[PDB]
Amino acid sequence: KTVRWCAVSEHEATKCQSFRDHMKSVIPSDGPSVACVKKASYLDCIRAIAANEADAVTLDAGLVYDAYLAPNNLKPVVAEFYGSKEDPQTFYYAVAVVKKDSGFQMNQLRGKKSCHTGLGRSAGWNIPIGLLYCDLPEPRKPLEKAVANFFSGSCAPCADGTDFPQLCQLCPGCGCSTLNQYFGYSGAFKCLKDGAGDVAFVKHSTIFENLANKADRDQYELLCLDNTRKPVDEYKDCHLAQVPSHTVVARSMGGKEDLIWELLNQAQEHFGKDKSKEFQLFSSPHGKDLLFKDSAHGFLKVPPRMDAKMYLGYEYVTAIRNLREGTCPEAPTDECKPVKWCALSHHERLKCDEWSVNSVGKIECVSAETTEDCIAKIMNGEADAMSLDGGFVYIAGKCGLVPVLAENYNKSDNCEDTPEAGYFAVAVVKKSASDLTWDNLKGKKSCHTAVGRTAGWNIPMGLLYNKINHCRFDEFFSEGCAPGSKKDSSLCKLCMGSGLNLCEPNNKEGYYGYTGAFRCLVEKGDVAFVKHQTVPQNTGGKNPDPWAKNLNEKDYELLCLDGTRKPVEEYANCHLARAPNHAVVTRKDKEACVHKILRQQQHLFGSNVTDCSGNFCLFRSETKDLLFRDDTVCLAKLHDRNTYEKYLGEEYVKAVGNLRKCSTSSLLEACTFRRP
Ligand SMILES: [Au+]
Ligand SMILES: [Au+]
Ligand SMILES: [Au+]
Ligand SMILES: [Au+]
Ligand SMILES: [Au+]
């Protein structure tokens, strides 16, 4: 029950020691205890934890990467935060600050004047230069020389000014102290404010630290990696990298990550911020930043689905990966590199493989275990693209993937030029029971297509979540028919299926499906959740079944959100959510390529090819809905609707977000950690 903490100095070792003693006093026998292993450096502590000689050490971002690499394979487990519990700020954001008075993008930096905090600083040098590496002219070695040849002039504090003079065209001499006015965070900023340089590579917070008034800050903007600009306020959507400030790492396997938390949590309570002046966890009597940044205001537990590559982020790992590997391509900078599609079944992999060979090597294939695994691969660049249902388009979005192409199902002449935006989830109720409004559904009897279905379960219950009486979903409706629920619950009490099929999600239920939940509506039921065209396709004599023959539209109204009621064909204005189509998701940086390659690919192997036995076609599966839903006719370009929030209804988002409170996703919880 003891955690072996690793110190990298003598001063640190001492702090660890009194950290042991002070935690020895307050904590009872059945409490965590601290041990103090002492090594020579951060690298040694890393190898020690790997060799199972120590348990935990707290690293900067650069070392977090080093730690995860073979043969160490360490992972982040506990993080320092630097604000309050509502504003944690466990991360910082390397930004590129510019005048609003200028007009140029990230990809137009070549030939501009730059301002760096200092050579070797992550935010002010490593990150930017790492991202810009391939855009620098050959030779890239040495780096200082290359960066000199990229910017017309620079202030790079702590550069070989005598060898690379241009790196100090803005601050002559390359002063690496506060005597150079263009040095550090405040200095790199003043380098911009004074109009000496065109761009300042700094932290998101730098601008707030140097300009108090929102008036002056508005004279500045941010360079986003997609070659757009945004106000200084929205760094969260316009940064060069998101960097974990200080992180605790342990073994990826057998790390005792729970003990570290159990310890560190009970430490920050007894000796956290403004706690005991007997011993400060975030203050050193013997130096500064011993074991932990004195900045820190506490700890947070890192969700367990988090690997190091996920925690640092694509951009961060790319920056340092370039600096180390230094391997740029040589292929025409115009032509799209192949798109790595992610498969999650054997049959998915097979179909993908065939696609790849006919794609003349323009499509590639990557296997992953689950959907959540495939999404992770997209995130960190192991894969490029995949098609997701609304539920996953949401999770991918929370992780910062973007919808680019919608699966079109309706035969449209120019469907390539029009997204669908899906059908409409409606709550239908007869005009008979006439005092029914959205509000007084509490304790009413209901009729769902099936539990886990979008229009039938997800959307309605998702929105009813605010008043759902806890994750107990059977408590809301006195009784109902939710095919798939446990065969003993209140939501199986209306399902008229004889024998084994009494509450089973299949045809033999009779009160299952869109058409079924509607029979459930009439045959013992108050309310039913279906699609917008379920009423018109079952009434008017469209359905010749015993119960359905003689039903008419005029009888059934649709329930609205605002509490009002409306006719059926007024669904457009009286709907719950806009149950969406499946959509191809990808990284923002590969948005351009996915669009083209997939447009060309659906031309060759699209819905427009017959003789699918002698020629490959993309929208036919061997089994069922491999890679894409087989109902797809084309892939619609998502102009405008190319964020998760903008592709899914604001209501769909609210609903799915609510349901995800009862059914956790380890990926989602990890992604929401980086983006709260
Ligand atoms: Au103490
Ligand atoms: Au550190
Ligand atoms: Au900030
Ligand atoms: Au205490
Ligand atoms: Au502080």
Ligand SMILES: [Au+]
């Ligand atoms: Au609860």
Ligand SMILES: [Au+]
């Ligand atoms: Au495009």
Ligand SMILES: [Au+]
């Ligand atoms: Au086409």
Ligand SMILES: [Au+]
């Ligand atoms: Au576009």
